[PDB]
């Protein structure tokens, strides 16, 4: 009754002082585990960002190197078509000259 | 002594005042961690979301640069291939020039 | 006629019965789409989660196979390099065999 | 009053018949847009899965090809150390023979 009640009240603090201080050692761990995670957020968030623009300017520098090479070909084909239509005219020179020697 | 027993009872009542403050702050403590764990899982979810968000942004554009590098290399070899065809015709053009240059000299010599 | 007017009023009341059923089913209709849109965004979130989940699973292990392929190639060249060292010593071992084979023949000839 | 009220009730259905049928054309679109999305879920979900195991067995086949090559080297070094300790013994043969010819 009495002593049992005097005893009944000190088991409630003895066990409690163990649970709460193991949980206080745990509340500290969790809020430490998120700091470990928040740093991991900022890292991968910052990392991928610079790693992204590294491919943005890449693609940009490259897709510009193509547009130049794209028209550079079309340029040569305008050059190729040019000295091609001169050549044909020259095939009509030897032609008219080949007819001359026939007429002597 | 009787007074000492009733005193002890008063102490037990004080403890009934204390232990109640105890058992309960644990309830206020236990919920405090529920709040942390509820937060933690949401962070490692945003983490897996960001890392997943960027990784696919890389994979999807790194596929476009590759399809560009191929499409580029495709015409870079075509330019060279047409660079030859340009020289072949040029070799003939200037060869057609020496003939009319000297077909001239002989009808001239005539 | 007066009866026809009151009849028209009865019609307007019937419409007061109808239009109320109208204006409201729109409210029951408008919420129906709120439910769809609320669902859609959650799907394209799970999508971006899955695609993000797999893509990183590939990227993280495709980095381990690469570090394996390098670590493999590292010893594959070391085996060959030690394959030579094994032959060099072998060339000497069998060369040390012909000497004691014929150092023998002469102390024998003696 | 009257006619205005007769009119006040038919604007509520005329406009409504337009809004609700444009929204019914929209409720159908959304539930179609999710079917387009649910298929996209099942695709990328199924795709990545087979693409995953393709790298699992890869790594497995490869990490087994290494363990064999790893011990294969250690084997040759036990072979190399073997014919090495024979060779040294043979360097003591010519040695003891080289001392003989000194003694004639």
UniProtKB/Swiss-Prot annotation, chains A, D:
<comment type="function">
    <text>May regulate the activity of kinases such as PKC and SRC via binding to integrin beta-1 (ITB1) and the receptor of activated protein C kinase 1 (RACK1). In complex with C1QBP is a high affinity receptor for kininogen-1/HMWK.</text>
</comment>
<protein>
    <recommendedName>
        <fullName>Keratin, type II cytoskeletal 1</fullName>
    </recommendedName>
</protein>
<comment type="similarity">
    <text>Belongs to the intermediate filament family.</text>
</comment>
<feature type="region of interest" description="Coil 2">
    <location>
        <begin position="1"/>
        <end position="104"/>
    </location>
</feature>
<feature type="site" description="Stutter">
    <location>
        <position position="48"/>
    </location>
</feature>
<comment type="subunit">
    <text>Heterotetramer of two type I and two type II keratins. Heterodimer with KRT10. Two heterodimers of KRT1 and KRT10 form a heterotetramer. Forms a heterodimer with KRT14; the interaction is more abundant in the absence of KRT5. Interacts with PLEC isoform 1C, when in a heterodimer with KRT10. Interacts with ITGB1 in the presence of RACK1 and SRC, and with RACK1. Interacts with C1QBP; the association represents a cell surface kininogen receptor. Interacts with EPPK1; interaction is dependent of higher-order structure of intermediate filament.</text>
</comment>
Swiss-Prot record, chains B, C:
<comment type="subunit">
    <text>Heterotetramer of two type I and two type II keratins. Heterodimer with KRT1. Two heterodimers of KRT1 and KRT10 form a heterotetramer. The KRT10 subunit in the heterotetramer is probably disulfide-linked. Interacts with PLEC isoform 1C, when in a heterodimer with KRT1.</text>
</comment>
<comment type="function">
    <text>(Microbial infection) Acts as a mediator of S.aureus adherence to desquamated nasal epithelial cells via clfB, and hence may play a role in nasal colonization.</text>
</comment>
<comment type="similarity">
    <text>Belongs to the intermediate filament family.</text>
</comment>
<protein>
    <recommendedName>
        <fullName>Keratin, type I cytoskeletal 10</fullName>
    </recommendedName>
</protein>
<comment type="subunit">
    <text>(Microbial infection) Interacts (via C-terminal tail domain) with the S.aureus clumping factor, clfB; this interaction probably mediates S.aureus attachment to the keratinized squamous epithelial cells from the nasal cavity.</text>
</comment>
<feature type="region of interest" description="Coil 2">
    <location>
        <begin position="1"/>
        <end position="110"/>
    </location>
</feature>
<comment type="function">
    <text>Plays a role in the establishment of the epidermal barrier on plantar skin. Involved in the maintenance of cell layer development and keratin filament bundles in suprabasal cells of the epithelium.</text>
</comment>
């Amino acid at each position: 009754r009495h002593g049992d009640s005097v005893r009944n009240s000190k088991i409630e603090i003895s066990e409690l002082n163990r649970v709460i201080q193991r949980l206080r050692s745990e509340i500290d761990n969790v809020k430490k585990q998120i700091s470990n995670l928040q740093q991991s957020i900022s890292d991968a968030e910052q990392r991928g960002e610079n790693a992204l623009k590294d491919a943005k300017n890449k693609l940009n520098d490259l897709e510009d190197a193509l547009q130049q090479a794209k028209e550079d070909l079309a340029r040569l084909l305008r050059d190729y078509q040019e000295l091609m239509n001169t050549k044909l005219a020259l095939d009509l020179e030897i032609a008219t000259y080949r007819t001359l020697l026939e007429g002597e | 002594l009787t007074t000492e027993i009733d005193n002890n009872i008063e102490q037990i009542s004080s403890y009934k005042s204390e232990i109640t403050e105890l058992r309960r702050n644990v309830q206020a403590l236990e919920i405090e961690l529920q709040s942390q764990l509820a937060l933690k899982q949401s962070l490692e979810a945003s983490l897996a979301e960001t890392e997943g968000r960027y990784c696919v942004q890389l994979s999807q554009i790194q596929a476009q640069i590759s399809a560009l590098e191929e499409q580029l290399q495709q015409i870079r070899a075509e330019t060279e291939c047409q660079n030859t065809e340009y020289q072949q015709l040029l070799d003939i053009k200037i060869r057609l020039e020496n003939e009319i240059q000297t077909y001239r000299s002989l009808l001239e010599g005539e």
